[PDB]
Symmetry: C5
Subunit: 310 residues, 5 copies
């Protein structure tokens, strides 16, 4: 018959979310409660009712007693898991109480950047039993699992936390137990507002002010340099994300600014060609369309993306 | 009844404060004095009264004698704690004297950048007992805890150090002992003065000198390029800090320079529009307002932030 | 006679492909099935039919029993192999079932950048037996080897996976067993399209718009600065790749833009030299060739590379 | 009575000096000679007169024999000390010969950047006895301590090496032994000459050549851009050093170039204001002062810093 | 008498050459054959003639039998040596066969950048015996030592590999054995050709095209900005190398472009001063010298360095 293994996972800290590598790092405590009647013991008066063991000697005790422990893996773990504590408390009954304090990076494969920077992401930790459900069954250790209240993350804000149990078939034919700690997080837009939206909007607004100088050459030089600035912002954005196979809301926003700036160069080349061919009066009359086109083009663009993505 | 565990923590070095990741790194010595009568021993004349042990064999001795050690965790630790020394001296009485020399990063979750770079921050190390207060009670080891006199930090300056004891309920239902080493540090502003204030002030002051050329086009070109430089400083500042969800004193300062520069472009476009419409005499008379507005706008802005933040 | 060693390798995650260092990193599970009759055991009723061991004690058991284990090496491994699990299950029969869960970087020496960014690459993991084929023979553990379906890689897309067995002669005179897990991957061009092709095409197209202004000096200034932008893109590309001893498709593409831009400066210098020598009418007539040359030169260049590389 | 512990430290390599973090890294060999009569042994003919032990088993032998070893700490060490060799050779007499080969970073708290880049710095390694002087006394192991002849450091040049013994009171009430290996190193100025002095001098000299064009507007544009270049060099310099609370010779040098460039903008604004107000003859006569002021200002500045710092 | 220790070292991979830190990283296999008659053993018929050991238990066996192993050090090693395999096979005779598979960085102190990028460098691995030549003598294990055929290095090309034996006196009075694996490597110039020579040559050639416009002011502006580009290339080059105390061929090349560009500014200032003083005809006649000087100056410079360095 199978023995119930009580799994509990609590994230104390978010040491960082690295969206370029699609992983996240936490400081966490894993807690297990497992009753093995074979490990039960008798004690003399004065002698303790609870035996405390370093994992090393407790595993060495299990091998001796020919007992199989609920060997588990953090399925989505990455690199080195640095351990703080690996302590066992064994009661007279045979109840094993295990605590595992660690720092570790975990794969974040649920990353969907299509709406970046207005995106919401799913982050999880998968705890799998190496042995199948006929031997060990994972149960939810109540009153422990979740996320702490001093996570240390400033950009991300955790919207909800969940725990559930499911099956996996990684090393076995038959179903094997899997404990899941899941959390959803959305982004604080302040960085994007201050470093990307406000600057891009300023460059566009103060560039439009110069249309009132009525110097077509000067607009051409301005739109040309503006195009270079947007290409530079395009590199600034791309450095935050992985080399995705798909278009971002931000990517569509930058391609939009490229198109409008390209047309600004084209139109003002045409108005200055009119001036060069002794048609200054005509270019000046058409200039009202060029001056009111600019704000309408960027405002039409903003409504196009907002529709295309929402 | 509970046994008194004497905790002492001394920070020898500050290997660095990383404000982008909100953590700090220290070289420290942890000192514990714990009397366990069960560990007492007899000795013959001439034979030593003090037994020296490597943690490995001392823990192996505790497991043998069925003794529970005051298992502790550095609650706010991050990653790998690289150890230099883990040495035990056991007296005939049963007094365990433990020394733990390490290099380690700790979470700095008390980071408040709202007044950056004129900010004061709290840094701490939390030492928690895994076992509750009915088993072990942490006491303050006197004459040891604090911060050394060659910390190696150049930007930060420690204002005060404190040690105290409190309860925690991390793994238990009932209260458990927690030792706290806290320190407050303020920043040396010289870097910000030399690399950010002086340059930004120079760009503004030498740009104002060119107002005396009375060339409105030249002011427009200068304010436009100045706006680009401020956007670049905006990125230089943002790279020092995390992607905060809130506004910095520095952020307000940069947004301010954007607004004033935006208006400088707008005003000088208007003066040059006057010159283009055969109203050069009028633009020249108004120019006194444009020339005296510039210094007043930046000086009014500086007094607005200084009021809004203090 | 030689004993069959059943090798199985499964890649769960691609933590990254680093093309500058020509290596890749995976999270993988190694599975071995090996029957050693010498390890067989008798059991009493109630006592388990399968003994579970930590690698440490199982190797200690092999040394005791004077048994030689199929010692292996990951031939193309690099640096530290961080291990998650190293577990042995020994059946009454003497069937050793070994599981090795790890994170590791592996050399990618098959890297051919000649067609970058339209390149397809071979990535493999080599598992070698230290002892020759007279002692141990590697066999393919069926229904396990391959690559998972949540690899976490965004730029690369795996086209096919293969497993095969071959000989090696690394430490021995005679042939020794080698297990091979191979995979082919092609690149998602979206990053190159969005950050390199679209910008380079825009700079070229909007620069051509200005030819309609008929200002030869302005074209010279524009082509000069365009040349600097392409040199900057040249550095942006070179930072992604190693310092190769051969020419890339991308390198040929950039050298092409340098040549065309060089000639644009040369031609427009000539047209402006005509204007300076009172031959404005002649320069204006020739200008049709200069205006239609530009698009044809870049379109002729694109067909030249596309032929020279395909 | 106290036993003499012979300490010897030899630095084979300087893996790097990181002045931003104020630390340095070495590959070194620690050598200890300690006679413990209790460890003495008898040997049979043919049996060795010197017993060789891995530190692990030698410490295990000391615990058994109830002997206290001279437990030491590298006081100024930082992070992980990677070990190559930890070997003990025990003679029939009881003379312990210990060798410790390691790679490690050490705190450099003696860093004085006030004269950078013409600075000389003190680097040391502190080896402390955990037990006081009544138990163990450190002595200087003769003919071993120092620095090798293939250190691998290219920027720094070691001027002298010293060894001495002093007391410390880190974990004890009474004085405890401390071994010191100290070295002084000065900087090779070639990098600063080639990448900072020559460029800054060229920008200044070739900018002065343009004064002979007698175009005041052109000088204003040149000095404005020069000011931006110096702000960029200011960032290039600041990236090499920590965020110091004090002024560098280099910082004074850059602030100087800012002031002179600021005045160049101011003066040439004035000369062009004269030209604009029909006083070109006056501006042209005063221009001799503006042309000879420039070289004298930078040469007067250089003599001011050279006095203020030496 | 001394026992022959057969050393063999094979480099499988070059994980990288870091010329800024003057070190290199390899994946290598160390092989030792050492006959110790004391380790010989008896076996019954059917029982194995070869005993296979994990280094841990084999060293524990040597300590037990009171045998001294040929303790060695990788003299030029740096940081952590990550081990893949540490396996011993002991024959009935007492022949120890040891295999050490590792990833490690080694100091490269033979680095001579004086002719960079046309430089050839020496790279080596030093394997030293801790015990002197009276105890152990290193011999060359034949048919193993060298470098593999899938090194994975793209920039460097290995010209030759050598193995030899020499003495060292690191920890002893008398000579001690040292095994040497040496290799020479030259650089693939393609990176330098594509990213540094072609761009610098283009900037120079297309800048010369504009001399045919006969606008002295425009040449001054072009040479001024060219000087800034060369200062930027000067930083791009310096970032690849350590902060050397000597001049590079590349450094001489950049200082040369600074001088020629400085003179271009000077000459064209003079020609424009002639035009300003109503001597346009004279400046136009002298212009032939200025136009033909430019190509001759750079071609004379290139022949000067090529002579000064070869
Ligand atoms: C930059 C946006 C500011 C808009 C107001 C117009 C004033 C001029 C701004 O400077 C100019 O900006 C161009 C575009 O970035 C560059 O091509 C050019 O070299 C630079 O002189
Ligand atoms: C910029 C701070 C220095 C002010 C002194 C005035 C002289 C000219 C300095 O160069 C200016 O640089 C800006 C930024 O690139 C350009 O927008 C602008 O057109 C250009 O004239
Ligand atoms: C950037 C190409 C955009 C084409 C639109 C034409 C308007 C001018 C764009 O600014 C150009 O930017 C270069 C940056 O290097 C300068 O060298 C060049 O003198 C300047 O005129
Ligand atoms: C620039 C140092 C070399 C001086 C030699 C005189 C020729 C002109 C150099 O081009 C300068 O480039 C700056 C870029 O920042 C601009 O701001 C400035 O207006 C422009 O004149
Ligand atoms: C860049 C080399 C190309 C040579 C052909 C001349 C076309 C103009 C290229 O733009 C130039 O950029 C320089 C660097 O910023 C400025 O100094 C210069 O005054 C400006 O005109």
């Amino acid at each position: 018959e199978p023995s119930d293994v009580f799994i509990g996972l609590k994230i104390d800290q978010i040491t960082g979310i690295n969206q370029k590598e699609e992983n996240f790092s936490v400081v966490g405590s894993l807690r297990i409660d497992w009753r093995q009647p074979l490990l039960a013991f008798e004690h003399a008066p004065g002698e303790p009712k609870h035996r405390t063991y370093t994992l090393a000697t407790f595993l060495k005790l299990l091998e001796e007693k020919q007992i199989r422990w609920p060997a588990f893996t953090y399925h989505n773990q990455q690199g080195r898991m640095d351990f703080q504590n690996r302590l066992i408390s064994l009661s007279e009954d045979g109840t094993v109480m295990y605590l595992e304090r660690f720092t570790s990076t975990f794969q974040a494969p649920a990353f969907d950047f299509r709406l970046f920077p207005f995106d919401n992401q799913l982050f999880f930790i998968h705890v799998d039993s190496i042995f199948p459900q006929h031997l060990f069954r994972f149960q939810e250790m109540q009153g422990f699992s979740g996320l702490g209240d001093q996570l240390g993350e400033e950009e991300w804000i955790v919207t909800e936390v969940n725990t559930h149990l499911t099956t996996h078939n990684e090393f076995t034919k038959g179903d094997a137990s899997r404990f899941v700690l899941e959390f959803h997080a959305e982004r604080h837009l302040n960085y994007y507002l201050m470093r990307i939206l406000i600057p891009v909007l300023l460059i566009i607004t103060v560039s439009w002010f110069t249309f009132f100088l009525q110097d077509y050459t000067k607009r051409i030089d301005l739109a040309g340099g503006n195009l270079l600035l947007f290409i530079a912002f395009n590199f600034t954005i791309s450095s935050d994300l992985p080399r995705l196979g798909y278009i971002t809301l931000m990517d569509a926003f930058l391609v939009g600014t490229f198109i409008i700036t390209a047309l600004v160069v084209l139109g003002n080349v045409w108005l200055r060609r009119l001036e060069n061919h002794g048609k200054q009066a005509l270019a000046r009359k058409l200039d009202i369309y060029a001056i009111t086109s600019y704000p309408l083009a960027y405002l039409l663009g903003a409504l196009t993306l907002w529709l295309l993505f929402f």
